[PDB]
Amino acid sequence: RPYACPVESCDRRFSRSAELTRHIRIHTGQKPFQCRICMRNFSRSDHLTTHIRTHTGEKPFACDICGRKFARSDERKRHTKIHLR
DNA sequence: AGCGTGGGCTG
DNA sequence: TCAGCCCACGC
Ligand SMILES: [Zn+2]
Ligand SMILES: [Zn+2]
Ligand SMILES: [Zn+2]
Numbered sequence: 001r002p003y004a005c006p007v008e009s010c011d012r013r014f015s016r017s018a019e020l021t022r023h024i025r026i027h028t029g030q031k032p033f034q035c036r037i038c039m040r041n042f043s044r045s046d047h048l049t050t051h052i053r054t055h056t057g058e059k060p061f062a063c064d065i066c067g068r069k070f071a072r073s074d075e076r077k078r079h080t081k082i083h084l085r
Numbered sequence: 086a087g088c089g090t091g092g093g094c095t096g
Numbered sequence: 097t098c099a100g101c102c103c104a105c106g107c
Contacts, residue, residue, distance in 0.1 A: 046100050
């Protein structure tokens with residue numbers, strides 16, 4: 001952890017500089033990415049991409065066992081486990 | 086379920 | 097730096 005967080009009201013530490021810069025947005029409240037469909041702003045581009053799928057209904061990740069589709073890979077990951085029990 | 090959102094990390 | 101994943105946790 002060669003880089004720490006300046007805001008006295010926070011005890012965070014990171015390995016990289018790009019990480020401390022992305023983190024700082026938590027405190028500055030920066031939300032650079034806007035959804036053109038609902039106008040909601042997001043702190044991250046990747047979260048904006050998946051959020052947009054809530055409007056379009058796009059579901060790229062299908063369960064290997066039943067084929068049920070999901071907007072995000074982690075949603076599918078959480079689901080696949082139910083085929084055990 | 087639906088889905089917000091930060092951390093770790095790759096490229 | 098940004099882009100874009102996985103991963104994780106929360107409600
Ligand atoms: Zn901080
Ligand atoms: Zn939207
Ligand atoms: Zn399934």
